[PDB]
Amino acid sequence: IRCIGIGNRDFIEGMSGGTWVDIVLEHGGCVTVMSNNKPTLDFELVTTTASNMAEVRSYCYEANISEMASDSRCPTQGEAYLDKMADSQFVCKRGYVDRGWGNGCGLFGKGSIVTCAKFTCVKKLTGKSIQPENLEYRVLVSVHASQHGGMINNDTNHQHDKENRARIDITASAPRVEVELGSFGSISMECEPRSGLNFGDLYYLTMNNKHWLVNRDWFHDLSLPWHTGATSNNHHWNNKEALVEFREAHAKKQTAVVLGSQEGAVHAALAGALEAESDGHKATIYSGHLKCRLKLDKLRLKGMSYALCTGAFTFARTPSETIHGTATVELQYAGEDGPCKVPIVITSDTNSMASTGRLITANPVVTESGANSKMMVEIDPPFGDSYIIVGTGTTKITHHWHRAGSSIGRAFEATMRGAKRMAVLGDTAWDFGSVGGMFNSVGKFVHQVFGSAFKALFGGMSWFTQLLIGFLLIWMGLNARGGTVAMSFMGIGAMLIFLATSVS
Amino acid sequence: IRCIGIGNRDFIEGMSGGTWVDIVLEHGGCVTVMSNNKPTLDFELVTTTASNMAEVRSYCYEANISEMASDSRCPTQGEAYLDKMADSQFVCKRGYVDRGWGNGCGLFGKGSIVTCAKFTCVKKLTGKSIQPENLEYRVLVSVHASQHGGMINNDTNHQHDKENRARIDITASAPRVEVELGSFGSISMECEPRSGLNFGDLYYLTMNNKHWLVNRDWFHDLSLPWHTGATSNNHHWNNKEALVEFREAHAKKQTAVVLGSQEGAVHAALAGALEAESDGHKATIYSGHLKCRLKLDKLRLKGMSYALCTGAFTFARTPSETIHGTATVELQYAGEDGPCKVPIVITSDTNSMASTGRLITANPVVTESGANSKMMVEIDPPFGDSYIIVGTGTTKITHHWHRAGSSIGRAFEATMRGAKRMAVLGDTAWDFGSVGGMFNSVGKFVHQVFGSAFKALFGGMSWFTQLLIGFLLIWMGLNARGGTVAMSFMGIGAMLIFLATSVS
Amino acid sequence: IRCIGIGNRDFIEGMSGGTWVDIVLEHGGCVTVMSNNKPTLDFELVTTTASNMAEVRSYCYEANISEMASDSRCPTQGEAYLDKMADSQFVCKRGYVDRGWGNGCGLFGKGSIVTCAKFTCVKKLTGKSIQPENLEYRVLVSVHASQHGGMINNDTNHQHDKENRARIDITASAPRVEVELGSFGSISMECEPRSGLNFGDLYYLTMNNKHWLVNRDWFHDLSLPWHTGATSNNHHWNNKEALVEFREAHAKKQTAVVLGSQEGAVHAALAGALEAESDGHKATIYSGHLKCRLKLDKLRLKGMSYALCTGAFTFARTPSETIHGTATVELQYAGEDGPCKVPIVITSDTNSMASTGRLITANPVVTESGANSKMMVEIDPPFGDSYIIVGTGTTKITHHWHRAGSSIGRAFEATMRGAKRMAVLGDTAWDFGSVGGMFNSVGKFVHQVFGSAFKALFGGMSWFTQLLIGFLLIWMGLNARGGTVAMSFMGIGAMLIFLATSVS
Amino acid sequence: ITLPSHASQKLETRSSTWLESREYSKYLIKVENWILRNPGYALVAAVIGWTLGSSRSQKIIFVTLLMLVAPAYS
Amino acid sequence: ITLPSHASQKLETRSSTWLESREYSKYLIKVENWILRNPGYALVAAVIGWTLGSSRSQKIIFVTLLMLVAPAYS
Amino acid sequence: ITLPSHASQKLETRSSTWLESREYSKYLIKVENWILRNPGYALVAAVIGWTLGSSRSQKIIFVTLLMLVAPAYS
Ligand SMILES: *[C@@H]1O[C@H](CO[C@@H]2O[C@@H](C)[C@@H](O)[C@@H](O)[C@@H]2O)[C@@H](O[C@@H]2O[C@H](CO)[C@@H](O)[C@H](O)[C@H]2NC(C)=O)[C@H](O)[C@H]1NC(C)=O
Ligand SMILES: *[C@@H]1O[C@H](CO[C@@H]2O[C@@H](C)[C@@H](O)[C@@H](O)[C@@H]2O)[C@@H](O[C@@H]2O[C@H](CO)[C@@H](O)[C@H](O)[C@H]2NC(C)=O)[C@H](O)[C@H]1NC(C)=O
Ligand SMILES: *[C@@H]1O[C@H](CO[C@@H]2O[C@@H](C)[C@@H](O)[C@@H](O)[C@@H]2O)[C@@H](O[C@@H]2O[C@H](CO)[C@@H](O)[C@H](O)[C@H]2NC(C)=O)[C@H](O)[C@H]1NC(C)=O
């Protein structure tokens, strides 16, 4: 039931013949899996956690200077020198000043001058490495077990609800799990925790209690003073000259000034990176995906041998419509004939009692043996007018329902959802809701080839360059002499423009 | 004599017929003026000062946020609203979250949310305006009065040397001064303190006790929170959204976070600006020029009616050469025939004993009546070998002198220096060492119009764009149809390239 | 008389009417000046000395290393680090080794390793600068005053012979000297001690008590460890990696080794430099020239009023011929005639007794008034056979002289000597034995222009490249008979070849 | 200094990037402010592009490329 | 944020500007880094430049302008 | 280390330079040793020279220049 209020929600109608299905969990999503004579299940990937991270390099972004000193030499007498040039904590520079009889020199001309200042870092950021064998994914499973509506985002005493909820920890040395769901049997998950988000070309950057996932190339192109991630008491700062500027004032003196704190400049440089969080010494990540294979052969309906309920039902609240077109119905049941089966039909006309819409919650039941107990069902009504009829006999309650839209619009939104999933996941999108098949394999192969070529050519472009190159390619295609290069140019251009103007 | 050990030094061989000459003092340079029967003078513009500057605009570069509050609405219930959205000390933003039975809402869909936080500036930078009536230039004048070598950059008891040294303050309320020089008479300066450096399109920027002179349209395009006018506690700020970012994480909540200190980012944005200093509340500037007209009628040689000396001269130092080709000779003199005229010849042929060079210190004399007193002459010796002979009779002393180079190299160096002064000063360069004439007038007028057009077309261009546009123009000229356009393109391109490679 | 045994000797046959002449003293030379009614003089530049030299830079040519250490890092963990990398006296380097489970690492791949070693200089060489105003030339002057042959290279009690010998020190602050020569009057020398040898392009190099004069470009391109001449107690050695090599042995270990003493390699690099000597803290130099002007108006013959000798003359030694064709005759006189005039004729035919060759020793006299006294004459006998007849009356002695050669061969030898002098001195050669003139000045100017162009084009070429380029130029001048270009090519080629095959 | 600009992680996950709300304003505001501060360069670029290109499309493309190169000096 | 870049005050006075020692490093370093990190863009830029220009000079200028626009996204 | 070679101060003064006795030995010995220990390069250079030169003089000059370039690798 944990999938009901979510706006990014997928529905998998598992194949009847087989008992396994391929799913891809994402962090801003949730998957509902329904199979023929088994309970409906909700899957959500909630947390990625990286541990045992190694520090690579520290960068200074705020520094001070002190103990400035200078020294000068007469012309044609070699370069100037200070003992502070033999100290590694000082940054020094050499230039030329004017010398003559007025300055105390015997000659006239450019003499050598040296300026030294003691460097000190006050604020630094770090970068760490993440090995895919140290990740740990957390997945939550919920059963559509006719819990009432006040349990959707309810975590009170969730460690006791061992039958409706399950929490799974997927690591690389434990990628296959048997999840026990009480009287519903079990499911088996076989996941691939090593090939999700590509943490191989990402560093975990920490700056002032904020955390990002950044590119490694970008992290090595930083232009700040740095030292190694190795442990040491006194670190030697490399490239101190990145934060200290030396200047000669009209060839009479030389002076050193430190630049300001770079926190805001780095914030501006991280504009497109991914944000992350911390948990002690562990990185907590809320982006990326996880591919799994579900086997439901040991999953069984609890209460498929229940008796029908004999008492009367009331609507405990108004049935609401979720943004995907399904509808939630909370019922209250009077009379105590124990756990029983809830009779509910969705029909186009009350005369014929012909079912026309299906259920999402498979096998809705009353779960308690008390007097006035609540339960919730999720249904998938047909387009147009319908009736939700609950109960049997002379106490049947009815609710009129209207579902706007059409089936053509539903197919169109499904197509756009699939296209967005392709754009986000690449060729992995072909493994979503897949049960094998030659068509899926050929599609995944062609997508792999074309995606590799497309990333090789147009990999390092921004929305601006994407737009420019796309318009140029569309123009070049509109003027191509023969075919097969006109359509190719225009297709690549349209793809680039679609990528540039995308969202999320 | 204050102009001797200076690398950027000019020599104005004054007019013979006239009595006034136009000079242009610059902060990095120094000018030596010599006329026929008058002493040689050294002029140096040493300080520009601006007082009572007008506050224009303050920008915040480091801020805090606090007192975060939020308000949410269920779907189809309008926008969320907080009372702090009416307070101007708060920054607020609206977004959408997912709402349903799990959150506490009766419907499913995008509910409106609003977040507000109290903005507080921690550190700000200020911009001020400088008016031409606020400026006060300081010029120093020294006389070549046979002071010894230990007086070149000597400021001990400078308030007692009323004959050889002079200090001049030029303002817009007093652009004309007359300077008395003891027995040398007096000079008169008529300067233009309202046309030196274009402070009309520059602001005086202050940030954390460092000061710049910056463009105005750059200061108006800063993207930080700002206000206008004076600054006092708990102020009001515009565009606070430049330092605060709001985010909805997976459509589940909304958070506000403040960006980091922008000190270093501003430092990096100030790359090509000019630096400055402070004197309490006064801007102290060491850049720019000042054009003056010099009148030397009441300037007279002192001691031109002395008797020649009769004692024995010695060399007190070794005659050294300044980088422009002159030589400074410090002489010690025994004998007490009082203030006497020093006999000194510079000859390249001891058979004829004819003079070959020319002095810079006009009328060198012994300035004291004691036993052994020192003086210093400055000479412009001829190219090749020569002798500097001091004294008369048998106690003469000689010094051999060799001056490398030729007059063609001298002329080429003079042409290069003139081209550099043109590039730096625009049409004002025609007023340097000018004594009138219609040729100077027409040249200055043509330079004025061409410089106006050139600044309109290629005003703000880095060396990169200068180089690129110059090469493109050179190509366009090389492939033009004929003349009258081609050479114009080539000249503009060559000028752009000559600017892109220049230094200082 | 000091120029008699020298093999590189020049003769200035003084102008008859004139009283001054220009000479160029060279270190491996000797000049004999003779004027009509004046004694003959010998000039020799013996020593050049430079004092007050400033140390510019010290280079290490023999060093040690000690206290080597290494550190390693596992892959994907950044660079390795030792605390010695924070010590300036240590030279360090980083590389990659193989890491795996065998090396104690958790991953497999390229790990980072760092090696550090303590550098220590054992033997260093020094470079110093020479100021042309610190040079001091020493010139020795001798008179052909009929001293006997046992005085040519005799310096016993030379401080008492204040009449026949003179020592002259020439500096820049005393370039003109009046040399008194007892009864012979006095000469005046006007030298140019600032333009002899271009010491402004040379450093004084000292290595293990041996000294050279070297170019400055060559000295600044040395690739050894170096520190500044501005000496401190503990110097920081720059470029320590020039004497230390790091090597990784099969990607398992890094090691450091120091190169050997570079003394012999420096000796080999100094192949074409100049040698020099030391005198305490001063450089003693025995190469280069000194242009000077001689004024002889106060020089008079001593003993032109003596009476002829009356006693008996004997040949005290066999008249010997010098390398240039002159003859030295040592006579012994028996007779107490006091200081008397020696009667001597040099005749081809004894019938007319007409003199045919001139004397070098003007006015040969018997100096001492004693019994058996010795004296020496030097004569320039004619070509062929002649008689040297000495004495009066019937007791006069004769010596037969044969001088081989002709005046044509003499002129050819003089042309070769002049061409060698030109090749060594450039345009300064036109000032040798010169009294002025328009032809002299025009030739010197043309020589200056052509020598400047030639030094610009073919300046720094060895004999090998000189030969190759000269042959190529001769070839292309042969197969190209354009206007005035063939002879130019072949003339430059012949010049290059003549320079290549020349000897010191 | 001049820190490097991170590439956009848009369309890699479902999350929003660090400062995604300003991803479009960044280049647009810069280019527009530069073009307003330097109006004569527009004439320079028009002349150069009209002289270099032969067909009208080539001229337009040259002018656009120059006007885009100038504000971000590249 | 996007702070504007100050125009160079070189050749306005005799003094050196604020960070004059780094006035060449920024553009060169940025452009060369981006260029040697993205070789496929060179290919596509060359294709577009050769397809758009008519003469050799036009194609060369097209390719140069594209290779300058891409690194500094403008 | 490759220390630089000092230019010859011959014909600068009347003195002899530091190691003037070996001024001709240092090049001839090396060149001839290399040419004798590498006979096949002679044929290589001959082939190249005869392939690039048109007239006989150009061929001889090319062969000579290659034979000189090889021993002192420059
Ligand atoms: C949120 O859940 C709590 C806990 O519910 C209990 O534990 C669950 C795991 C599941 O087993 C439920 O069926 C359990 O009732 C709810 O608090 C309970 O409410 C019931 C109803 O009155 C009461 O009998 C229990 O004593 C309560 N338990 C506790 C620990 O207080 C709570 O009502 C739920 N919130 C909403 C809005 O429905
Ligand atoms: C720097 O100047 C001081 C002061 O010079 C005096 O005041 C000047 C304005 C000018 O009028 C000078 O002629 C004056 O002498 C020098 O100090 C004096 O030095 C002289 C020796 O030259 C000595 O006789 C005086 O007693 C000194 N008086 C004082 C007050 O110091 C000083 O020597 C100068 N520095 C150098 C390096 O020469
Ligand atoms: C080398 O010279 C010495 C010294 O000569 C004396 O001093 C000279 C400056 C000059 O004035 C000479 O005329 C002087 O005689 C010679 O020694 C002298 O020899 C003479 C004669 O043999 C003798 O009468 C003196 O007493 C000697 N005096 C001294 C101080 O020795 C010496 O003979 C010369 N050598 C040769 C080979 O001739």
Residue numbers in the entry:
A (entry chain C), B (entry chain E), C (entry chain A): 1 to 504
D (entry chain D), E (entry chain F), F (entry chain B): 96 to 169
Sentences reproduced from the published study:
The surface of mature, infectious flaviviruses is composed of an icosahedral shell of 90 flat-lying envelope (E) protein dimers, the main target of humoral immunity. In contrast to their mature counterparts, immature virions possess 60 protruding spike-like trimers of precursor membrane (prM)-E complexes (prM3E3). The pr domain of prM binds to E, obscuring the fusion peptide and thereby preventing unproductive fusion within the already infected cell. When immature virions reach the low-pH environment of the trans-Golgi network (TGN), the trimeric prM3E3 spikes rearrange into the flat-lying conformation, characteristic of the mature virus.
From the same data set, we solved the structure of the mature form of SPOV (which lacks the pr domain), allowing us to examine which changes occur during maturation. We selected mature particles and reconstructed a map to 2.6 Å resolution. The virion has a smooth appearance, typical for members of the genus Flavivirus, with a diameter of ~460 Å. The E proteins on the surface are arranged as antiparallel dimers, forming a tight cage that almost entirely covers the lipid bilayer. Unlike DENV (which is also glycosylated at Asn67), SPOV E possesses only a single glycosylation site at position Asn154. Although the domain architecture of E remains constant, there is a significant reorganization of membrane-associated helices of E, going from the immature to the mature form. In mature E, the amphipathic helix H2 is splayed away from the transmembrane bundle of TM1 and TM2, whereas amphipathic helix H1 has reoriented by almost 180°, relative to the helix bundle. Notably, although TM and amphipathic helices are tightly packed together in the immature virus, the reorganization has left a pocket-like gap in between the helices in mature SPOV. We examined the EM map in the vicinity of the pocket and found that it is occupied by strong density resembling the headgroup of a phosphatidylethanolamine lipid (PE), with partially resolved fatty-acid tails. The PE fills the pocket between the membrane-associated helices of mature E, thereby keeping them at a fixed distance and position.
